[PDB]
Amino acid sequence: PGDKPPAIEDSIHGKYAGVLFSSASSNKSLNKVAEDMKYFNQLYKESEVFKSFLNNVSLKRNQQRDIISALGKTNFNPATNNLLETLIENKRLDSLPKIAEKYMDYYRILNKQESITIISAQELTAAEKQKVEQGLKKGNANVQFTVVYQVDPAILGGLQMYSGNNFLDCSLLSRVNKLKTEIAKISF
């Protein structure tokens, strides 16, 4: 997709993840590295020793290299192996988790599927929810999506949709405030 990550950032983990995304997407593969990075994230939180190993800084470079090999020398894309070697050489191994997370983020941005959250005061009847799906479809009409619901507002009879990074307010509470403000400014 133009060998260009979604975003460019100067942070340590951001810099490495962008290079990995570019390099990976360059040769052929991104999904393979995604599983590798996803595996590291799950392991970083599930295995206590692995977390202590990464954070450990008194460890020598050769020692870090041997332990990584013991983990696994295969089932990791060559880019991932080269990335680990570079991190060991640059003493950046401690930041390996963040990189992983960050990478998946970018990957999840490339994912077309998105989750839409609707906020309404009144409980949404199943029949009403089906109508809402029809409206969201007709609005997009070209992308499949998963819907989520949430009802604990102060607004009433209003719908507010959150879609990843966009917010659309159809709440009646907004209408109430707007009218009370404009009526005040009549300047009769």
Added chain:
Amino acid sequence: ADSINNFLANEYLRLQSHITSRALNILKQAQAYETMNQAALLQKLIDDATSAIDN
């Protein structure tokens, strides 16, 4: 003689200004009160509208 004549003349002018100024201030003050009355009536109307929304 001339001083009293000049005194009466200038005093007559001052009294004329005083009477016209009073006649003008009364009417202007009335107009201000009238505008306030009209504004209060309309403000009452707007408050009923806001109360309808609340209801």
